[PDB]
Amino acid sequence: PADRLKALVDAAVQPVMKANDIPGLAVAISLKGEPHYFSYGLASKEDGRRVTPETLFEIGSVSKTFTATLAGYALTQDKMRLDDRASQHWPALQGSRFDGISLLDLATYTAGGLPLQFPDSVQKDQAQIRDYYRQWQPTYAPGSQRLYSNPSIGLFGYLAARSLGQPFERLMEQQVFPALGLEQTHLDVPEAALAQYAQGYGKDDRPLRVGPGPLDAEGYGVKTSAADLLRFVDANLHPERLDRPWAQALDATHRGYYKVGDMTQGLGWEAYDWPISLKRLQAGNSTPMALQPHRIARLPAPQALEGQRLLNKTGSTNGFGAYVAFVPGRDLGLVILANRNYPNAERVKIAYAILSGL
Numbered sequence: 598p599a600d601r602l603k604a605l606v607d608a609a610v611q612p613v614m615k616a617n618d619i620p621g622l623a624v625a626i627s628l629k630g631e632p633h634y635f636s637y638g639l640a641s642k643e644d645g646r647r648v649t650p651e652t653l654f655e656i657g658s659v660s661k662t663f664t665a666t667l668a669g670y671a672l673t674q675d676k677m678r679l680d681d682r683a684s685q686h687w688p689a690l691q692g693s694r695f696d697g698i699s700l701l702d703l704a705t706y707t708a709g710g711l712p713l714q715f716p717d718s719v720q721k722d723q724a725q726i727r728d729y730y731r732q733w734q735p736t737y738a739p740g741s742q743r744l745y746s747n748p749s750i751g752l753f754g755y756l757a758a759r760s761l762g763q764p765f766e767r768l769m770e771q772q773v774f775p776a777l778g779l780e781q782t783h784l785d786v787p788e789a790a791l792a793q794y795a796q797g798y799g800k801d802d803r804p805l806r807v808g809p810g811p812l813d814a815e816g817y818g819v820k821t822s823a824a825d826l827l828r829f830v831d832a833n834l835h836p837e838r839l840d841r842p843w844a845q846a847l848d849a850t851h852r853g854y855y856k857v858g859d860m861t862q863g864l865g866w867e868a869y870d871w872p873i874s875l876k877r878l879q880a881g882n883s884t885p886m887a888l889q890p891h892r893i894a895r896l897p898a899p900q901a902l903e904g905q906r907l908l909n910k911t912g913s914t915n916g917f918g919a920y921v922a923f924v925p926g927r928d929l930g931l932v933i934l935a936n937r938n939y940p941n942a943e944r945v946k947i948a949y950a951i952l953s954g955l
């Protein structure tokens with residue numbers, strides 16, 4: 598059995614790796630509560646380090662699901678509410694347009710046209726981050742247009758930490774990751790763990806690791822391994838396995854709020870009906886969904902993302918490419934971590950091939 602699944606994953610991953618020149622890749626699969634890991638290639642082409650289920654990858658915007666779990670905790674402890682105006686949790690923003698923007702709009706990228714990235718002139722400094730939001734003028738009315746945005750959900754995470762009374766980075770290290778049982782998950786990789794930190798590769802195989810930037814922790818900062826990230830996936834498949842406060846914090850992120858095409862937007866997670874064709878799942882994770890605006894169709898009420906559904910999230914840095922997906926009704930979870938930023942369509946292709954069947 599374990600040899601037949603290894604042959605499936607190997608048939609799913611190996612062609613895509615060679616086709617995209619991916620130096621190293623790690624797959625972690627959860628089925629019926631049983632873990633399975635599959636390692637391919639090299640974490641470092643220079644020093645010949647091989648990929649293992651403990652290899653640390655940059656998961657990029659998959660971090661947004663962790664940020665959402667943090668926000669989920671604040672909501673369950675009644676320190677904030679999704680319809681709260683943004684400037685309520687940051688007095689410096691009072692008098693700016695964020696007096697009429699809800700946290701939900703920020704969490705779900707519908708504030709009114711916040712861009713993908715902070716301007717290059719905005720540095721990792723609170724005052725510059727403050728000034729940026731203070732002078733920002735909307736392109737659209739709130740809650741009408743989705744524009745994938747790090748400033749948007751980054752502010753969402755930053756305000757969640759404020760409502761809790763501590764910085765975002767500290768709350769993650771000392772509460773979230775320990776509460777989720779994650780010891781191989783970091784925002785700032787300890788010096789003792791750097792040996793497990795895979796090298797990233799891009800155009801011309803120039804080495805690429807992520808550097809500092811405004812609200813980087815909230816938007817795309819997590820580094821973890823396939824095994825540790827699968828622990829997180831399992832925690833999403835079985836929130837009851839955690840203490841009550843953190844079970845409710847994960848269930849909070851399993852709530853859909855509006856649709857765009859086949860994709861239902863939750864907190865961090867993006868959901869699809871299952872089964873669904875590969876082309877449609879690829880279309881939902883394609884570049885236009887990240888760089889271009891889209892009108893939304895709001896659901897009459899929060900829709901639980903449970904049952905025959907596929908929750909997922911992509912993640913890309915300059916040198917890494919991750920994809921996470923799980924299916925509640927099937928009790929199946931999947932993690933694909935790679936040290937090259939290769940097309941999301943290819944990430945979904947690997948995941949879809951594996952999911953095909955059982």
Ligand SMILES: *[B@@]1([O])OC2=C(C([O])=O)[C]=[C][C]=C2[C][C]1[N]C(=O)[C]1[C][C][C][C][C]1
Binds near residue numbers: 912
């Ligand atoms: B994030 O990784 O999500 C993302 C994706 C995706 O979902 O796969 C695709 C294109 C852009 C983004 C934005 C996020 N990534 C970053 O902001 C990244 C930019 C380069 C430097 C490190 C952070």
